[PDB]
Design a protein around this ligand. Structure first.
Ligand SMILES: CCCCCCCC/C=C/CCCCCCCC(=O)O[C@H](COC(=O)CCCCCCCCCCC)COP(=O)(O)OCCN
Ligand SMILES: CCCCCCCC/C=C\CCCCCCCC(=O)O[C@H](COC(=O)CCCCCCCCCCC)COP(=O)(O)OCCN
Ligand code: HEM
Ligand code: HEM
Ligand SMILES: CCCCCCCCO[C@@H]1O[C@H](CO)[C@@H](O)[C@H](O)[C@H]1O
Ligand SMILES: CCCCCCCCO[C@@H]1O[C@H](CO)[C@@H](O)[C@H](O)[C@H]1O
Ligand SMILES: CCCCCCCCO[C@@H]1O[C@H](CO)[C@@H](O)[C@H](O)[C@H]1O
Ligand SMILES: CCCCCCCc1cc(O)c2ccccc2[n+]1[O-]
Ligand SMILES: [Ca+2]
Ligand SMILES: [Zn+2]
Length: 754
């Protein structure tokens, strides 16, 4: 019964939090805005069907528009937010209809006020899944319908391709998820629907299905009381637990303890370290991630360029033709997760034999096979996205094309081969680790924790399958975040962490006992806040008001584990010094330390800059989000992968040929460039965009007009300095990875014994 209480706590934490999430998941499904079987006029004339709405949404995914603009604040920022934009048109129309832009202020005042009292009342009948909307609203639906036909035909005057939507892209009829009916009327319908629930009061409630989001006076959308109250409450509860956790942390010494006495640093003779065929094979895995990292960055350079030159890349042509923003965005996200995730799977391959004590038979075979599996998935899924968005696919867009969800752009059959790949991966890890699990008595020991977390990798991605074209937007978004917020960060904040504890225990730098207890404490506070904290993504995506409290409170608690960082980085810096200038893992620790500092600054402070429900009300779906997004994603996960990537490359390259000079340069260039693009561009544009929404309405902050202001453009233009500096850091890494295969060692032991 070694760490019994810590186990009860962790298990209980996981149990309780998982329930809350599921309960809240249920309340969403049950309280999200409805999609009526028929929405119609005062004459009883049907204009919309649950099937239309599902289709509009479907073509929106079909054409990967979520990698261009947003809906309900989620998606890309090059384009606008269709919910807020469609809501304005629909509202403007209602004004004109009742206006029968020339009226007096005393006059436009009256009408405005009239459309307010009329549009915010819920006219949906729960008893009968049908919604009826006044004429003033139908006239509005018209303007919305016309508006987007012009848009998806003529373009949006900013980055969007002309007449991108065309029937010829899909069969006469019997179209996959989109309905038998003009496609660009389904879209206008989908957009209108989101715009409908965003401005219509929930039944019995006093605020809308999105808690009065987006901000927009003309529609009566203003900040809710919950948004302000929970901003204060969430922080006070955080202040309360920081104290409590700090005390628990201090009283139980819940951190790693050095395993060596003063001056007694352990010897690290990498030259006489068993090496196996599967490890050296996992070595080339890293040069590819290093390469995917290179291309991923480039697409980023491209996206940033498009804010300054919308439809061209320095005059050239094919570029905006074959590689437009939405498509480039998708790859940027897809490759980010791909190279970072993949870096840790490789790390898993690499340490697997070490945990077991030998090379599993056919390991190299399986490893090599897993290799060409992802390489296919990557090259393949990307090809699919191109064909899918472009229309050179039929009803195979969902299965092989672009699924239409930011962060989840690959097609389902592509997702299937993904899980199998991970499943295989899992098998490979298990084969090599298996015997370790057998020698390890304590079922909650290091190796068991390493194995339990490793399995969450493939398993947890399965929740993505609860998502498909006809799912209600809010409910599908609910599950999407399980992958973005729980999965991606489950791959890195749990698996990676236990993998490092293992590495530090192996190098004999920290006591094993000390380490597993530490992991327990981290996992409980990490899952104790993060699981429910997922909710801050549900403030305004249409989920019930309950998530504003739940999300605000638990995401704020996520900061707690983060402050026990700047000081963990120091303990690491410290032992890095305890090892002289001949310390083999210098580069690894420099990236390790950085991961930690960016965790406090990128996720901690920049993430919190936009966490308050009162702030998010205006900020949600704006430049500060990417500001935080980079500081956190690249600052934390990227650096971490790189730390581990270099750790392996060190156990594979012949020492004599190694030189961490170039790595110091990369580390400096990566860190400075990241901070530079966040501070010099993303941050200041974010403030302007939030200010712009506060004074004119969120629609104004999301119009291309905002991106066109000179001030915005200059801010946007100077991003090239730090983006280049970042780019330089990544090529140095690439160049070090590539010309590293030229100095590799060869396996010491085969299916032998270490
Ligand atoms: C919006 C603001 C966001 C700010 C984000 C800040 C991120 C902070 C990043 C820190 C990187 C830490 C890297 C390891 C530091 C500890 C080990 C170390 O530095 O050893 C150094 C060389 O380090 C190295 O060679 C490692 C490379 C150090 C390069 C740091 C550049 C970071 C600049 C951040 C501010 C723009 C040896 O030289 P010394 O000056 O004696 O070391 C002591 C200074 N730490
Ligand atoms: C909504 C979802 C939210 C996220 C939830 C998943 C999070 C995944 C990430 C990390 C999970 C780490 C879980 C560690 C739990 C350890 C509990 C534990 O080991 O208790 C042990 C028995 O465990 C046992 O006998 C085995 C039970 C514990 C492991 C079971 C498999 C768990 C797999 C989870 C991933 C799919 C108590 O007895 P022991 O000390 O092991 O045995 C005697 C030792 N002298
Ligand atoms: C030369 C460096 C880079 C540049 C110029 C760059 C540029 C961009 C641009 C322009 C966007 C557009 C978001 C939008 O409008 O929808 C973006 C998004 C994003 N980038 Fe990068 N990027 C770079 C490096 C990275 C790296 C190294 C990572 C981490 C692996 C990363 C992760 C992301 C993520 C997660 C998003 C989506 C965030 C959001 O939509 O709010 N980027 N990037
Ligand atoms: C290393 C950990 C973290 C990573 C990698 C991360 C990453 C990201 C990314 C990539 C996005 C953009 C999602 C999108 O494209 O729509 C995002 C959004 C967000 N993050 Fe984090 N995050 C982390 C930690 C945190 C923490 C600790 C907080 C709490 C203060 C937080 C609060 C938010 C909020 C509120 C948004 C929503 C922005 C909006 O709706 O406009 N994050 N995060
Ligand atoms: C979320 C915070 C969980 C904290 C769990 C603390 C569990 C402490 O557990 C205690 O640790 C002591 C050593 O420090 C041991 O001597 C005790 O026998 C043991 O019960
Ligand atoms: C600090 C966190 C406080 C959380 C309080 C959650 C209160 C949930 O309250 C419940 O919300 C449901 C809708 O989601 C309603 O259908 C239920 O009738 C209501 O009791
Ligand atoms: C993105 C650009 C990556 C460039 C990688 C260049 C790697 C050069 O690599 C070097 O090539 C020499 C032959 O030319 C060999 O003799 C060296 O052993 C090899 O390390
Ligand atoms: C293959 C596409 C390579 C991209 C080349 C463009 C270089 C480049 C890189 C950037 O990071 C920029 C940031 C802001 C504005 C412009 C930028 N430009 O032009
Ligand atoms: Ca986004
Ligand atoms: Zn989150």
């Amino acid at each position: 019964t070694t760490n019994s209480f810590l186990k009860s706590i962790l298990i209980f934490t996981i149990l309780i939090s998982s329930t809350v999430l599921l309960v809240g998941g249920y309340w969403i499904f049950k309280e999200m805005a409805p999609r009526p079987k028929e929405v119609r006029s005062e004459s009883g004339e049907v204009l919309m069907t649950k099937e239309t709405i599902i289709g509009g949404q479907a073509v929106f995914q079909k054409y990967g528009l979520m990698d261009y603009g947003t809906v309900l604040g989620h998606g890309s920022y090059m384009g606008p937010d269709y919910t807020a934009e469609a809501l304005k048109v629909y509202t403007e129309g209602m004004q004109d209809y009742k206006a029968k832009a020339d009226l007096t202020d005393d006059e436009k005042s009256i009408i405005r006020e009239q459309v307010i009292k009329e549009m915010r009342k819920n006219r949906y009948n729960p008893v009968t899944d049908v919604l009826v909307l006044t004429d003033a609203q139908v006239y509005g639906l018209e303007k919305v319908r016309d508006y987007y036909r012009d848009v998806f035909t003529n373009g949006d005057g900013w980055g969007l391709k002309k007449g991108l939507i065309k029937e010829s892209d899909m069969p006469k009829a019997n179209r996959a998820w989109v309905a038998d009916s003009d496609q660009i009327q389904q879209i206008a319908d989908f957009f209108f629907w989101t715009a409908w629930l965003s401005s219509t009061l929930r039944i019995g409630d006093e605020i809308t299905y999105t808690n009065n989001w987006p901000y927009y006076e003309d529609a009566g959308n203003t900040m809710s009381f919950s948004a302000v109250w929970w901003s204060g409450a969430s922080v006070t509860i955080l202040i309360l637990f920081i104290g409590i956790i700090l005390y628990v942390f201090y009283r139980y010494q819940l951190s790693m303890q050095e395993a060596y006495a003063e001056g007694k640093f352990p010897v690290i003779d990498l030259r006489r370290q068993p090496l196996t065929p599967s490890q050296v094979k996992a070595g080339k895995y890293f040069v590819v991630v290093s390469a995917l990292f290179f291309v991923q960055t480039m697409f980023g350079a491209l996206l940033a360029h498009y804010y300054t030159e919308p439809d061209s890349f320095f005059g050239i042509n094919w570029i905006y033709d074959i590689l437009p923003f939405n498509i480039a965005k998708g790859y940027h996200l897809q490759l980010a997760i791909f190279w970072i995730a993949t870096a840790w799977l490789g790390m898993g391959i690499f340490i697997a034999p070490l945990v077991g004590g030998q090379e599993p038979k056919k390991q190299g075979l399986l490893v090599d096979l897993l290799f060409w599996a992802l390489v296919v998935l990557v090259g393949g899924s990307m090809i699919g996205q191109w064909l899918g968005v472009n229309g050179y696919l039929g009803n195979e867009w969902f299965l092989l094309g672009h699924q239409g969800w930011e962060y989840i752009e690959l097609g389902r059959i592509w997702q299937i081969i993904l899980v199998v790949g991970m499943l295989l991966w899992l098998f490979i890890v298990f084969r090599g680790v298996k015997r370790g699990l057998k020698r390890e008595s304590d079922k909650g020991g290091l190796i068991h924790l390493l194995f339990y977390s490793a399995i969450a990798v493939p398993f947890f991605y399965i929740f993505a399958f609860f998502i498909q074209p006809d799912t209600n937007f809010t409910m599908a978004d609910f599950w999407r975040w399980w992958i973005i917020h729980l999965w991606v960060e489950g791959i890195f904040e749990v698996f990676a962490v236990v993998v490092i504890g293992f590495l530090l225990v192996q190098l004999r730098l920290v006591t094993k006992k000390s380490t597993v207890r530490a992991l327990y404490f981290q996992f409980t506070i990490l899952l104790g806040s993060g699981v429910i904290g997922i909710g801050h993504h549900y403030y305004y995506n249409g989920s019930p008001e309950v998530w504003i409290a739940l999300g605000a409170v638990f995401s704020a608690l996520e900061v707690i584990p983060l402050t026990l960082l700047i000081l963990e980085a120091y303990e690491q810096y410290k032992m890095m010094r305890d090892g002289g200038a001949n310390f083999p893992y210098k580069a690894t620790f420099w990236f390790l330390i950085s991961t930690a500092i960016w965790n406090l600054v990128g996720a901690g402070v920049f993430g919190f800059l936009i966490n308050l429900p009162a702030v998010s009300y205006f900020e949600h779906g704006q430049f500060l989000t990417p500001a935080h997004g980079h500081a956190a994603m690249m600052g934390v996960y990227g650096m971490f992968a790189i730390a581990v990537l270099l750790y392996s490359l060190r156990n594979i390259v012949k020492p004599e040929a190694w030189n961490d000079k170039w790595l110091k340069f990369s580390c400096w260039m990566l860190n400075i460039g990241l901070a530079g693009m966040v501070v010099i561009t993303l941050l200041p544009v974010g403030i302007l965009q939030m200010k712009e929404a506060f004074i004119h309405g969120y629609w104004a902050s999301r119009s291309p007009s905002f991106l066109q202001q000179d001030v915005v453009q200059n801010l946007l233009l100077v991003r090239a300095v730090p983006d280049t500096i970042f780019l330089i850091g990544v090529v140095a890494l690439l160049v070090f990875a590539i010309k590293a295969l030229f100095h590799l060692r060869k396996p010491t032991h085969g299916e032998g014994e270490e």
